[PDB]
Amino acid sequence: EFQRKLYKELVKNYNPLERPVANDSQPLTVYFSLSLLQIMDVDEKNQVLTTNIWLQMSWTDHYLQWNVSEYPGVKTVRFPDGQIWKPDILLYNSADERFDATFHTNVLVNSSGHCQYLPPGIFKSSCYIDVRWFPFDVQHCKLKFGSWSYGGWSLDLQMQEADISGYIPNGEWDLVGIPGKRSERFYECCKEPYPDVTFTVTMRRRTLYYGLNLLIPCVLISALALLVFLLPADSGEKISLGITVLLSLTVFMLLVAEIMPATSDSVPLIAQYFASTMIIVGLSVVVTVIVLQYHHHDPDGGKMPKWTRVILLNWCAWFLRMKPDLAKILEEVRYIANRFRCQDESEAVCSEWKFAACVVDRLCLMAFSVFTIIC
Amino acid sequence: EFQRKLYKELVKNYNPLERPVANDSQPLTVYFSLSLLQIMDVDEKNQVLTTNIWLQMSWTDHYLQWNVSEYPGVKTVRFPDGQIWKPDILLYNSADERFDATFHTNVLVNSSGHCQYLPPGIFKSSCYIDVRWFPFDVQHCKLKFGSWSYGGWSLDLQMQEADISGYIPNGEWDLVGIPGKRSERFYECCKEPYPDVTFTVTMRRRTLYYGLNLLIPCVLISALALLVFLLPADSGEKISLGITVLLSLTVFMLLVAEIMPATSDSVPLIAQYFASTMIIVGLSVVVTVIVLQYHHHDPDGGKMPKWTRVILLNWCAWFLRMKPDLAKILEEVRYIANRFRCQDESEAVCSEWKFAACVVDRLCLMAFSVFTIIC
Amino acid sequence: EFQRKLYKELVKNYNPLERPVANDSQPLTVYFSLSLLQIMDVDEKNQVLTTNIWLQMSWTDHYLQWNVSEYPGVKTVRFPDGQIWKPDILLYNSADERFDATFHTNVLVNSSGHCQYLPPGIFKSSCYIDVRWFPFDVQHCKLKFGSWSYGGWSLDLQMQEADISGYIPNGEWDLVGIPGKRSERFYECCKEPYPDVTFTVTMRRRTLYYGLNLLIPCVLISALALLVFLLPADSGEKISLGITVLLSLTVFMLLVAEIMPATSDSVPLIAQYFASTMIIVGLSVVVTVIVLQYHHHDPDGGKMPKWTRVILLNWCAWFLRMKPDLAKILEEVRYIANRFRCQDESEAVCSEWKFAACVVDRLCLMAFSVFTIIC
Amino acid sequence: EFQRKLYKELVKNYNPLERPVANDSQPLTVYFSLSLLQIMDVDEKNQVLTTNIWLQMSWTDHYLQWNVSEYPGVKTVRFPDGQIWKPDILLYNSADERFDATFHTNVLVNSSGHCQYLPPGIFKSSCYIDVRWFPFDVQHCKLKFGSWSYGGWSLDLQMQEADISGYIPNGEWDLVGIPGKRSERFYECCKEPYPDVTFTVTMRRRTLYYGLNLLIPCVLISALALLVFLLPADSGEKISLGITVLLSLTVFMLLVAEIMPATSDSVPLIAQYFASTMIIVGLSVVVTVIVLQYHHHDPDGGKMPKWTRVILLNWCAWFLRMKPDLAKILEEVRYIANRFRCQDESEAVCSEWKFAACVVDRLCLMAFSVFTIIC
Amino acid sequence: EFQRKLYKELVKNYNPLERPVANDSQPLTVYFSLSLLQIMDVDEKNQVLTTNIWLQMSWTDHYLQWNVSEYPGVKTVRFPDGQIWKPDILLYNSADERFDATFHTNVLVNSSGHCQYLPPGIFKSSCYIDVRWFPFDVQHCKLKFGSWSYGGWSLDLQMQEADISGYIPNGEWDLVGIPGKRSERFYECCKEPYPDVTFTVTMRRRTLYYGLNLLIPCVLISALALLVFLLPADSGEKISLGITVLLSLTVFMLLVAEIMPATSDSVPLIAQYFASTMIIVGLSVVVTVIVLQYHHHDPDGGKMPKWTRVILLNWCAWFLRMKPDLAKILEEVRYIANRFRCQDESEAVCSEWKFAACVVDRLCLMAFSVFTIIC
Numbered sequence A, B, C, D, E: 001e002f003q004r005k006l007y008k009e010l011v012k013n014y015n016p017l018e019r020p021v022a023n024d025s026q027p028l029t030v031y032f033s034l035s036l037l038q039i040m041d042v043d044e045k046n047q048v049l050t051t052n053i054w055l056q057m058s059w060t061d062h063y064l065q066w067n068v069s070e071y072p073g074v075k076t077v078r079f080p081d082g083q084i085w086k087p088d089i090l091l092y093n094s095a096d097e098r099f100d101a102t103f104h105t106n107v108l109v110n111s112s113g114h115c116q117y118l119p120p121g122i123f124k125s126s127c128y129i130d131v132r133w134f135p136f137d138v139q140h141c142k143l144k145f146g147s148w149s150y151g152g153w154s155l156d157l158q159m160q161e162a163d164i165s166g167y168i169p170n171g172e173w174d175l176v177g178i179p180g181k182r183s184e185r186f187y188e189c190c191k192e193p194y195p196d197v198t199f200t201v202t203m204r205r206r207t208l209y210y211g212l213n214l215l216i217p218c219v220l221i222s223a224l225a226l227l228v229f230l231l232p233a234d235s236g237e238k239i240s241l242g243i244t245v246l247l248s249l250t251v252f253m254l255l256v257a258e259i260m261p262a263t264s265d266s267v268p269l270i271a272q273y274f275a276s277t278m279i280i281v282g283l284s285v286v287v288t289v290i291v292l293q294y295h296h297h298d299p300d301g302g303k304m305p306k307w308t309r310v311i312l313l314n315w316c317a318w319f320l321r322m323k324p325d326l327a328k329i330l331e332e333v334r335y336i337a338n339r340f341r342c343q344d345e346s347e348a349v350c351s352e353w354k355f356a357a358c359v360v361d362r363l364c365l366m367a368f369s370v371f372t373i374i375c
Ligand SMILES: CCCCCCCC/C=C\CCCCCCCC(=O)O[C@@H](COC(=O)CCCCCCCCCCCCCCC)COP(=O)([O-])OCC[N+](C)(C)C
Pocket: A279, A282, A283, A286, A301, A302, A303, E220, E223, E224, E226, E227, E230, E321, E322, E323
């Protein structure tokens, strides 16, 4: 009875076009805040933050006022989109194909004219995502809100601290905080300044999954590439091991090409580890080729340079703690004996080249080890 | 004739803004339930439950009442969106880009004013999906509904048991149950409390497909990695087998990277099996390198430590139940004979190193076997 | 002139809320059919059938009647959405995020009041897709239509045979038929029953592409895995061949993981062939390891069990149709001669182990062959 | 002043429901054409053509006429959706989830009543895409337009040649032409016939990218598979080369599985080349196994069939232009000498088997070469 | 008070259909510019530029004028969509499924009637993307705006320089500039010309990420393929190395198939490097097969052509700075001695073929090196 009467009286001559101030020369104060409910998604490749947010807007409407003695029990009223003046506050840096993602709900007005408006929405905002320090990276995503067509002379936007009481923690992003800052800006469009409120959502990535999926595979690849230096050359498998470890690395590069977020803005420090490991694997293949040249050296070819015969077989080697008819028959047997004694000599020469390969092989083992550590 | 007359009389002075109570100071009771029809999708990566649901809302409208003797045959009427007051009940934890997924249908009103409203819809809700015990995991997805702008003083939400009579079983998720609980909450926005009804959909994953696609490949990989310990060293293929099994493991890691749902919140126990198998494969490659060092040992290098000559060739070995001119011609032949007798000695020394490799090879076979069992 | 006059007269006092019957106590008959134009997509993973359909609804409207002598030439009229009463017939088992996919068109009404309404639309419906017999699988997808808010007492839904004259054959699904069945159901919501019409679209998959992309690769993999039993052991490549065939199998498992539709409801019989082939490949690798143990057996180790010396070298082998100073010099030469005669003996022992490997190798060839056939 | 007056006079009693003809018994002529601006996408897998098109509709409206002496300067007027009668022309074979993709713009009307209406839109149409001759394939995609609810007695659709002056060439599809044909069809719905205009867009694929990404890899794979026949058997790598070439082929099959469009309707002739190359690779692996059996033949096993000793070592070989105490000491030395003379004989027998392998190896080289050519 | 009065007076007799000019014969000038805020995405495969833009339109409305002495404090007013005449300026080359992506906001009008309208929007435009010089490629994407239904006689479009003060730099595309050009075009539709304003957005790709992900892998592949020429032939692994490097190349071709943008219009010069590297790898495999034929040559087969014995062993080799009873016993020993002396001769012949392989091996090393440089 009284709710009906009030609803009929309130709209008499009301104009949703009119900014509802008593004095036209004065600006209308609008308090703007928001409630952060959940960080739905952080799109690194598209540079888009998705959030579930309840916007909070409050203003006084001069015309929507009533004495609650003449309408007993009617302490508030509600108006849908289009029947009440509302601030046209938009998210400036929206990434939504519709640009305005707010779901339009009721404005709640009490008897002194105070208008409350809390539209929810899944908001997409354009956020510059810096993955230089990925996975230990902190992102500052700005949410810039402001009246689109009401400037500072007409709509005095004011900020209130963002609400996080209802926040639901994300399983990948730790909410550091959501500070806000009201600014008064000028635009080439207009001589009048347009205030805005910007909420910076500071997020801290929880790195566990990434440290478990991206870093241990590099240690296992590097380790399996460094086992080539322990594999004997007689096996005939050093190249198989090293080249197959590199093929596995390439497959893991496909995986990394998917798991790791790339935005092309910088060079994630983490990727200097992927590079260190690809270079250690390729250089262990190059050094396995050098060791194989040493091991398979031709005994009838060149002679081992005295230079290397002392650099490796002596110095490095020590540092590694490594160590008539009767006469006709005589000529026939002597040939055989000397043939034997000559292949034996060639086998000894071969044994030094085979030994040098072992020494070079272990030196590379230790050298490659320390290099991994520092990197 | 009477349907027309009733439809004309009912809207006379009706106001869809008015909460349709007789006494304004009193709250309006709204019974809220839902019918679960189908669980369409459980998005683990986006943390979104998709369901086909029929919402059920019922209230009494004081103005929509008629005597069915003055309108014979007209026992009910129907009103579309915008011509009747309706509760503004939303899904709070919506993940829909539109936020309100309900398809708006007719409100059915009978002659005493009872309003029934069963809007259908494909509802997306944000659900925390815990895959710690995947594939034997149970998910509790909350559906929180409540009036957006009507608080507890105006709209007394009441719950009724959810309907599952029409449910269609999912081929991947067993519906344990959908209990509900009405709560009365406070929000920083407002001093008035806002009741809500929350339906918790408890689902139990049917693990067959996952146990068939993800677990047997790990047993086949582990088994093929443990066949390296039975492959003879003379073959010259132990490294080829082990390293290729690891390459196949990496490809299977791509597959697992797709089939398995990862949400980065925890560490699926199942993944401790993927880790156990990758470690068994890498350690069988390391132990194959050690066996190859033993087998390919240089007979003219070091001597087999008595320590190991007893630890392996004796103890482990037993535990495994393993086992003038004429004189010038004489000198020539003696050299040849002694050369033979010296290579033979070196061949025997080599045979112990080749034997030790076999013993170490089988010990690793049994050791690796028991390790798999416990893990 | 007459079209204008008729359009003005027809809407005078018309109410799109009124079910357009003359007697209010009687139900309104609505004939419902559809024209199937094209089966756009069969989503096995999401369990969604997409179709292009023209719905067909016909009823009589008591008020939309005119004498075509007073409006010469005006034999029909057309009304858009919102200006005429229309049945609210929805697809119950919709999978569309909007839930109602019908494109709203004109209702065509002739002079006796007969209303025709053929809205087109791209309809998504939830269909249980059973791939047990994939690719020779037949799917029965239900399309359940019914009035949402008009029960059997108000709207007497009646069915007419579906139209397929305009159907455009799909390149992957053969339309067996689209039978319909009108049912009268009860729901927990309501004591009144709600009739519905359900069209079951029966589809038969055209299996060519699948038989060409999924089955021949398994025959080629199995064949290349069985060529290991013909490869000699001296080559030193049996393991390379078998393990690389298994790696190729894993890559083909990625392909199958994409081409093959999996819905987790059952276990496609076809997949018992994928399992048979993976098991034949892994068991040919295990049997190649056994053959290699036989071939590389140590002549100074154990002795070939008489048991196997008769089981293989005799029985299986036959079944396969397989087959002073002078004296000092004497001692020196005798040693050499006996050394030769002793390695020769050891070479013969080795030749039986090498022979046994060949016999086991071919037995496995034939055994593995018959196993493939039956599977 | 005059524009305002005309706009007020024109809508007086206007009815957007009225087909705007002077005589009601007569049909209204509507000229229909379109401007093709760009072929946006040809979806082979979903069988959907996407185009940017400007529809062109023209008709005369009897009521929208004015004398341009009483409204000086006002030579045309414009009306938005809903304030003027418009033809309800739809794309019958739409693949758009909304079914009507036209963006609704102004109708331009001049002083004699001629209505022009050029709505733009991104149109999705269902097109049967035949990839039998891919990449040299020509597609005929139909665009069927017609009035949905106005039959031939009410709306006389007429065609005009499609406009391509503004067309922007596609980088993948050459526009052969867009002929049109007006048809008068009957439907089971209705006894009245419904005319339609169908524009067939004929496209010719520009095959460069496909010939560069899909065909050369098959020539390189086939060539690398045929280098196995030139690799010596002593290398011990023929199987490694052939089986790894097949593994690379499988990876390339993944690539082809993505680049190549498959619609399951036919069997792209191009794919007979993919099959020819997979079969040449598998058969070169089979023939490498046969060559290896020849090369590794056991000298103490069977004897080379005279049959093959003449077929290969002679005929094919020629066609390829290929080619007391003292006595005790005597017995000891004679044994050694005869042992030598016996292994030598066995080495010669081995050399024929090794020679035969070379002859078979080259015959397969030439045979496989000619086979590639014809295929 | 005055805002209300003005809003009531301004709409009295206003007609949003009327182009708001004082003289009807004259055209209305509309200034059109835009503010570029962010280049959201450059879709090379779909040929679509996505941008966040604020359109800027300004015109004078003759009717929306008031004296600001009779409405003190009211210096501007605002009108939403549908209550004021607005230019119907569309993006001609839109790629949006809705075709008009502009979010409709208020028109701001001051007291002399000047209308300002700055609708924001996420605009999709069809842009021809030329990747011939990728990654050092510059794209010119046109944005063609114009009145759809107002020709040059009614709406005199005029251009103003685009605004970039608010631009936010993209992490992948450097904004060179956004020049504009107003054109007056004719269309087959209409005899009247339709002016348009086209803004060409010139972008310069920042190539770092691409040079790091696509080019270094080709240098590492080419280098690992050229290490086969340093690997000794005795290792028995040249083919394993080369063929596995090619397999890794194929995997990298999958990666390139994803990272690299292909539009099929041209042939990216960069891809001539991918071709150079695939050809160097395949030709090093072919030359490794030739070297293996040389190394494994049969000493009892043909003789080394004098031609090659001088071309390689001399010329190239030098350029590379590379280098009774008693008598019966005599016959027995002589045989053995001569057998030895004959295998030795055959070993020397083999050593020249093994030497020639080394010379050919290094020549190919240097030849392949210079070829890489030039390419
Ligand atoms: C730490 C190593 C370098 C690392 C950095 C990479 C640098 C380049 C890589 C490897 C370089 C390795 C050194 C060269 C090989 C040694 C050959 C030699 O000693 O003599 C040979 C010279 O043969 C040549 O011409 C060698 C120089 C050509 C190298 C070209 C690089 C190709 C690999 C690219 C791979 C890039 C790496 C991939 C990265 C992921 C022959 O001579 P000799 O017969 O031995 O001499 C005795 C003869 N005498 C008795 C008659 C006197």
